[PDB]
Amino acid sequence: NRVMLPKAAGCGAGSMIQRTPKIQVYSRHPAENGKSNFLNCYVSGFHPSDIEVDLLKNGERIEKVEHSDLSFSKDWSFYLLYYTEFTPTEKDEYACRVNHVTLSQPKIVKWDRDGSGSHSMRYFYTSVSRPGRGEPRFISVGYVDDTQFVRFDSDAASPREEPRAPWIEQEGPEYWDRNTQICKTNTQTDRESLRNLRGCYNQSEAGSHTLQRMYGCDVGPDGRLLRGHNQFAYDGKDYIALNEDLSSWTAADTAAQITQRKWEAARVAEQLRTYLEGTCVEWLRRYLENGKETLQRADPPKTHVTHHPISDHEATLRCWALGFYPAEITLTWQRDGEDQTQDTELVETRPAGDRTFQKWAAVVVPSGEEQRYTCHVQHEGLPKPLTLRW
């Protein structure tokens, strides 16, 4: 259940970070001809949020592709999963084509075939002005751990808080009407906040800017609050955050300090603390119980090692983790028991599309010395860490 958020203050009386997308193209399951599968293109770590993604087959654009609702990572960078059902063959070449302001031409990536008891609730808000093209777009999503359960999109035909997980559907009309109202109000707040922030930085009304907000709570196995959060970013960078004491603020610069003093005088922190200690944890406990059959089940990783020769003198060992939930995992390579921190390559953890996640860690090793390396796997669905070799 959401909370009403305060408005950023105007200043009366300067940097844009651009991150280019990471792109991973992969199937949900190990690919086997004839058997239907899912082709995924995961685009992550990008900023700003506008992006164009096509799945290609032998160079041709695939229609019907779906994608996830826009959300972002802890560093404020955005991620999206684009996916389609497909049946691979031997000589069909699949690819993902991505365009973004950081790319001087579209980038094509081919498909290369070769628990704990603690829980979190988060709401993620993205508001993007579009000068000359109407009002800002507002998209927000709610998660319990790594499971999305609501979305709101101000560009939907009828903007509403919408269910996105089966266990939320049982909530009555009061729940949907109330949280819709908070969204529609949080919409107009962020709209005035975008205007105020533009003025604080003397920015032109001709340019697009991004407001991102996150709040929610962490609970332990017994249901008690472990930590509350309420963060605010402008153009992909920290702006103002509620501190861990839920009673003071950290402001990034002199503009954000004006907002800090406004929220201090209005006692915003006290209102947020009341929400985080009460409503937030109370509804998180309720969701955990209503969805316990999926939300309180950790799926351990299915793990294996593959060998890919880099010529006849060295080779890549790749440690694979598949089908795990939640997403948090640690993969480490060791040589004679010592971690290969310097030489281990780690891809970003990526969604399978079926709620589970995937990751690999790779290290190049001297040929004939593969047997000295072991992959170490830590996941909350594993009673003990796993160790594997090639």
Numbering used by the authors: 323 to 335, 999 to 1099, 1999 to 2274
What does the paper say about this structure?
Human leukocyte antigen (HLA) B∗39:06, B∗39:01, and B∗38:01 are closely related class I MHC allotypes that nonetheless show differential association with T1D. HLA class I molecules consist of an allele-specific heavy chain that is associated noncovalently with β2-microglobulin (β2m) and a presented peptide. The α1 and α2 domains of the heavy chain form the peptide-binding groove, which is characterized by six pockets designated A-F. In general, two well-conserved primary anchor residues occupy the B and F pockets and are located at position two and the C terminus of the peptide, respectively. Upon identifying a peptide that binds to both HLA-B∗39:06 and B∗39:01, we determined the respective X-ray structures of the two allotypes presenting this peptide to 1.7 Å resolution.
HLA-B∗39:01 differs from B∗39:06 only at residues 95 and 97, yet the two allotypes are differentially associated with T1D, with B∗39:06 conferring the greater risk. To understand this difference at a structural level, we sought to compare the two highly similar MHC molecules presenting an identical peptide. To this end, HLA-B∗39:01 was produced as a sc-pMHC, including the covalently linked NRVMLPKAA peptide for HLA-B∗39:06. The peptide was positioned as in the HLA-B∗39:06 structure, with the first eight amino acids (NRVMLPKA) occupying the peptide-binding groove. As F-pocket residue 95 differs between HLA-B∗39:06 (Trp) and B∗39:01 (Leu), we concentrated our structural comparison of the two allotypes on this region. In contrast, Leu95 in HLA-B∗39:01 allows the F pocket to more easily accommodate hydrophobic side chains larger than Ala, consistent with the preference for Leu at the C terminus of the bound peptide. The other dimorphic residue between HLA-B∗39:06 and B∗39:01, though not in the F pocket, is at position 97. In HLA-B∗39:01, Arg97 can hydrogen-bond to the carbonyl group of Pro6 of the NRV peptide, while Thr97 of B∗39:06 is unable to do so. Subsequently, using our cell-free competition assay, we found that the 8mer NRVMLPKA bound well to both HLA-B∗39:06 and B∗39:01, consistent with our structural findings. In this assay, NLRP2 320 to 328 bound to HLA-B∗39:06 with an IC50 of 14 nM and to B∗39:01 with an IC50 of 35 nM.
